[PDB]
């Protein structure tokens, strides 16, 4: 009814900030939660006692490229 | 056996079919003290006579829907037969001469369970057995 | 008798059709409250 | 060929027998009611399955059931 | 279980399972196997509010 | 009775809900 | 934290305020949407932050949920009033409005009236007094 009556700016638009947190907790740096594999100074990014995330630099090239369907923009 | 004059009916279409000649056919027989007109179970209206009436119907629900109509004409003497095509007329309603609403003696408790309905056994009691769960000889 | 009249106006469809004209106060709270009132724009 | 069982919650009000359109049920004498009656179904081969005896039973969770089983030419109401 | 008393139902197949009902009549014959007739304040399903019960499936509340 | 096993599994799942909500409001890192 | 810039410096919201009609629907409610977070298309989103929108999200909770449990508590205390009068079959069709208003102003302080029945154990009915099925 709001778009029909002219005022598209009066829509109730809830940003899904809990599943935008999931992508930002896996490597999607688009939103900017900056935590937990979006923060490269974290315990989960570096894995401080061993540093054996050999999967991680190849994964973050995939999740942050905007040409694949891996964790689409929400 | 059976006898009587047919009511004045000008022919219908909902009457007997090839089942009535080949499998079975029913016949209601009443007597009337009046030249009155009744509604046929096969659609329409017919005038019953003053003597013994005789009407051939196709199934038993048509006779007792007609038998429930004659009981509103205060005619409660009707006999319903069942005519196999070899000619064997059995007599089925009312069987003992008495109507099944009022009780008579000598009749049997047939298909009777001696439990409440809610305490029938589970269908896993009767698994891979011949009986159903409502036959169930325990209680 | 007018003493059975308001004993009819207290029945179910009457008081639940005046429970919609009393909810024409959402017409007046969206007339002079510059109707656009989003979920962050009222206190 | 349906199966009309009758349970002992009966009260002998004869209402299922008056509602049957095919004369399957009938009243036999009994000892566990004030009417002294209970229904019985001797003509269950004439059971048309229509459960009109079940709508007439006034006992709560009714004392008569029709268990719709192997249907035949007179248990399906075919005049042809 | 006397006439006029309020009683609760322990028949699991019934509509009024664990419902309070007023006793209407008790039969003194002793051979009917469901003597007590209890009347309830809510109909079951398009119909009755009275039903014959036994005495072993009834627990009084007052 | 005092529920001792229904609690400390419901407030253990509520605890895991509060560590995830600690990272969500960037409280801990 | 997110890309939801406020609508003050959002470069796609100022065009919605640039070419617009006037009457009552796109002037004063549009400058009141300026303090709202809006994305890259100039539409005011509803995000959940820690403190900047702590009470900004808690006014639609606390204002609604009071008069959600104000309709519900005056409807519960009316159905309990007419069942102690032993006439509940006929008082539900013909609403006794001197009592329904009396059970409405008793529900104006319902959060401090529900917990007086939770600790007294009178909010819920116990499981052996509720009708169930064969289970
Ligand atoms: C029964 C209610 C219900 C159900 C089944 C869902 C289900 C869902 N929500 Mg949701 N949500 C709800 C109520 C509900 N929500 C309410 C009342 C709000 C506040 C407006 C939200 C705000 C919200 C956001 C921002 C997001 C979701 C998302 C989701 C999806 C993922 C699960 C999740 O993280 O969020 C569950 C959140 C909860 C708070 C659980 C609800 C617990 C009870 C019902 C709250 C009681 C109401 C309360 C008093 C008000 C999921 C399909 C995510 C999504 O959209 O994926 C793309 C997402 O990011 N929800
Ligand atoms: C089949 C139906 C279906 C279902 C059930 C889901 C379910 C979900 N989707 Mg998906 N989606 C679907 C179809 C579906 N989707 C389709 C058809 C598309 C279009 C391509 C998408 C595109 C999509 C994207 C791009 C994303 C999702 C996401 C999600 C997850 C968000 C829940 C969340 O926030 O965690 C709960 C939040 C918490 C903080 C956990 C709470 C802590 C607990 C209580 C402890 C959730 C599991 C997000 C995701 O992938 O996350 C895995 C997301 O990035 N969906
Ligand atoms: C529906 C919700 C959802 C889904 C589908 C995922 C899915 C994923 N997550 Mg994620 N995550 C979520 C919610 C979700 N997450 C939430 C709420 C948080 C905040 C606590 C995180 C924080 C998070 C981190 C820090 C990481 C992931 C990682 C991963 C990926 C690897 C999963 C795996 O094999 O390890 C499972 C193997 C186990 C042994 C289980 C571990 C159990 C933990 C310790 C608890 C996978 C795509 C990893 C990744 O991105 O790899 C590239 C990664 O490091 N997630
Ligand atoms: C549900 C979310 C989630 C998921 C799927 C994972 C998944 C994973 N984590 Mg992780 N982690 C998480 C949340 C998560 N984490 C959070 C919230 C923290 C902060 C407390 C961490 C801190 C962490 C560290 C320090 C390490 C991992 C490691 C790992 C990986 C190996 C798991 C294992 O060996 O057993 C695995 C893919 C290990 C790894 O990188 O493998 C070499 C590693 O050492 N995680
Ligand atoms: C919940 C996420 C998470 C996961 C999945 C892991 C997983 C792991 N940790 Mg880790 N850890 C975590 C959180 C986590 N940790 C946190 C929050 C801390 C800080 C208290 C540590 C501190 C820690 C130390 C000191 C060590 C590990 C070690 C290990 C590894 C076990 C031994 C091995 O190499 O194989 C394993 C993969 C061991 C390791 O890295 O092997 C050399 C080890 O030395 N972790
Ligand atoms: C390598 C990366 C990776 C990995 C390891 C995973 C792993 C997983 N993903 Mg994920 N995902 C990924 C990448 C990845 N994903 C990517 C790139 C996307 C696109 C953005 C997604 C999008 C995605 C979505 C939308 C979903 C997942 C889900 C899941 C989980 C499903 C497994 C499951 O159902 O349990 C197995 C379950 C069974 C076999 C059923 C049997 C269980 C029995 C019957 C007992 C359980 C009864 C239960 C407790 C009853 C409770 C009922 C009620 C009260 C809840 C799993 C851990 C799903 C999920 O569950 O989210 C948490 C989910 O919907 N993923
Ligand atoms: C003018 C035509 C008209 C219309 C459109 C309605 C419409 C309605 N009536 Mg009503 N009714 C009418 C005439 C009408 N009635 C008349 C002349 C009488 C006799 C005085 C009634 C007596 C009546 C009663 C007792 C009830 C309704 C109820 C209802 C509602 C039924 C649906 C529902 O909410 O539940 C509905 C909106 C029911 C209701 O609950 O109202 C919300 C209900 O209890 N009506
Ligand atoms: C994300 C999807 C969300 C789904 C919504 C949830 C729907 C169901 C919500 C209520 C469920 C109630 C069932 C549990 C309630 C219940 O069954 O209580 C009963 C159960 C048994 O109690 P006992 O037999 O020990 O006796 C009670 C005493 O222990 C009292 O302390 O208690 C538990 O085992 C705790 C159950 C927690 C189970 C979850 C923990 C899982 C561990 C995960 C790691
Ligand atoms: C002003 C406002 C507010 C408030 C609001 C409110 C207060 C609300 C409300 C409201 C309400 C109060 C509503 C209501 C409703 C309802 C309805 C509409 C209903 C319904 C229903 C149905 C339809 C159901 C059905 C059914 C049944 C009965 C059973 C079976 C199933 C089914 C589902 C079918 C706030 C603050 C938020 C803000 C914004 C605006
Ligand atoms: C805060 C927050 C949130 C979250 C939330 C949640 C997650 C929740 C929950 C919760 C829960 C988990 C709950 C519940 C419950 C339980 C129970 C148990 C209940 C109930 C009920 C009742 C009991 C009711 C009552 C009443 C009232 C109150 C009044 C009226 C009447 C009645 C009766 C209805 C959100 C996101 C939104 C937003 C942000 C923050
Ligand atoms: C008969 C009957 C009945 C009735 C019905 C009716 C009568 C109805 C209807 C209807 C309705 C219920 C409606 C509606 C509506 C209306 C409205 C809704 C309006 C209004 C108003 C206003 C308030 C407006 C205002 C304004 C103006 C004046 C101008 C300026 C602007 C504005 C818009 C502000 C019942 C069922 C009860 C019951 C009994 C029978
Ligand atoms: S089944 Fe019905 S009609 Fe037959 S005895 Fe029982 S209550 Fe009476
Ligand atoms: S199914 Fe029909 S014919 Fe058979 S007993 Fe019931 S009402 Fe009578």
Short mmCIF file of N, CA and C and ligand atoms in Angstrom, two decimals, chain A residues 18, chain G residues 48 57 61 68-69 72-73 76 110 114 123-124, ligand 10:
data_model
loop_
_atom_site.label_atom_id
_atom_site.label_comp_id
_atom_site.label_asym_id
_atom_site.label_seq_id
_atom_site.Cartn_x
_atom_site.Cartn_y
_atom_site.Cartn_z
N UNK A 18 20.96 -10.47 11.61
CA UNK A 18 21.48 -11.67 12.24
C UNK A 18 22.11 -12.61 11.23
N UNK G 48 19.50 -3.21 14.23
CA UNK G 48 19.56 -3.46 15.67
C UNK G 48 21.01 -3.30 16.12
N UNK G 57 14.43 0.94 19.61
CA UNK G 57 13.72 -0.27 19.23
C UNK G 57 12.80 -0.76 20.35
N UNK G 61 8.33 -2.18 21.33
CA UNK G 61 8.06 -3.36 22.13
C UNK G 61 7.15 -3.00 23.30
N UNK G 68 -1.01 -5.09 24.23
CA UNK G 68 -1.36 -6.43 23.79
C UNK G 68 -1.90 -7.26 24.95
N UNK G 69 -1.25 -7.15 26.11
CA UNK G 69 -1.71 -7.74 27.34
C UNK G 69 -2.68 -6.88 28.12
N UNK G 72 -5.78 -8.61 26.26
CA UNK G 72 -5.85 -9.99 26.68
C UNK G 72 -6.21 -10.16 28.15
N UNK G 73 -5.77 -9.24 29.00
CA UNK G 73 -6.08 -9.37 30.42
C UNK G 73 -7.49 -8.89 30.75
N UNK G 76 -9.54 -11.84 29.62
CA UNK G 76 -9.42 -12.97 30.52
C UNK G 76 -10.16 -12.72 31.83
N UNK G 110 -1.86 -4.52 34.64
CA UNK G 110 -1.69 -5.97 34.49
C UNK G 110 -0.27 -6.55 34.64
N UNK G 114 -0.33 -9.91 36.86
CA UNK G 114 -0.03 -11.25 36.38
C UNK G 114 0.91 -11.96 37.34
N UNK G 123 -2.45 -18.47 37.66
CA UNK G 123 -2.53 -18.11 36.25
C UNK G 123 -2.84 -19.31 35.38
N UNK G 124 -2.20 -20.44 35.66
CA UNK G 124 -2.38 -21.64 34.87
C UNK G 124 -3.35 -22.58 35.58
C1 LIG H 10 14.65 -8.53 23.56
C2 LIG H 10 15.12 -8.61 22.13
C3 LIG H 10 14.65 -9.50 21.24
C4 LIG H 10 14.56 -10.95 21.57
C5 LIG H 10 13.50 -11.53 22.14
C6 LIG H 10 13.51 -12.97 22.41
C7 LIG H 10 14.52 -13.86 21.76
C8 LIG H 10 12.60 -13.50 23.23
C9 LIG H 10 12.00 -14.33 23.85
C10 LIG H 10 11.26 -14.92 24.78
C11 LIG H 10 10.63 -16.16 25.24
C12 LIG H 10 11.40 -17.44 25.15
C13 LIG H 10 9.40 -16.16 25.76
C14 LIG H 10 8.37 -16.57 26.22
C15 LIG H 10 7.53 -17.28 26.96
C16 LIG H 10 7.23 -18.35 27.89
C17 LIG H 10 6.00 -18.52 28.39
C18 LIG H 10 5.73 -19.64 29.34
C19 LIG H 10 4.91 -17.60 28.00
C20 LIG H 10 3.74 -17.18 28.10
C21 LIG H 10 2.65 -16.76 28.14
C22 LIG H 10 1.71 -16.50 28.93
C23 LIG H 10 1.53 -17.33 30.16
C24 LIG H 10 0.94 -15.52 28.66
C25 LIG H 10 0.23 -14.88 29.60
C26 LIG H 10 -0.69 -13.75 29.32
C27 LIG H 10 -0.25 -12.49 29.53
C28 LIG H 10 1.20 -12.20 29.81
C29 LIG H 10 -1.18 -11.30 29.52
C30 LIG H 10 -2.37 -11.59 28.63
C31 LIG H 10 -3.02 -12.86 29.12
C32 LIG H 10 -2.11 -14.04 28.87
C33 LIG H 10 -2.62 -15.24 29.65
C34 LIG H 10 -2.13 -14.32 27.38
C35 LIG H 10 14.31 -9.03 19.84
C36 LIG H 10 15.17 -9.78 18.84
C37 LIG H 10 12.84 -9.26 19.51
C38 LIG H 10 14.56 -7.53 19.71
C39 LIG H 10 15.94 -7.15 20.25
C40 LIG H 10 16.17 -7.62 21.69
#
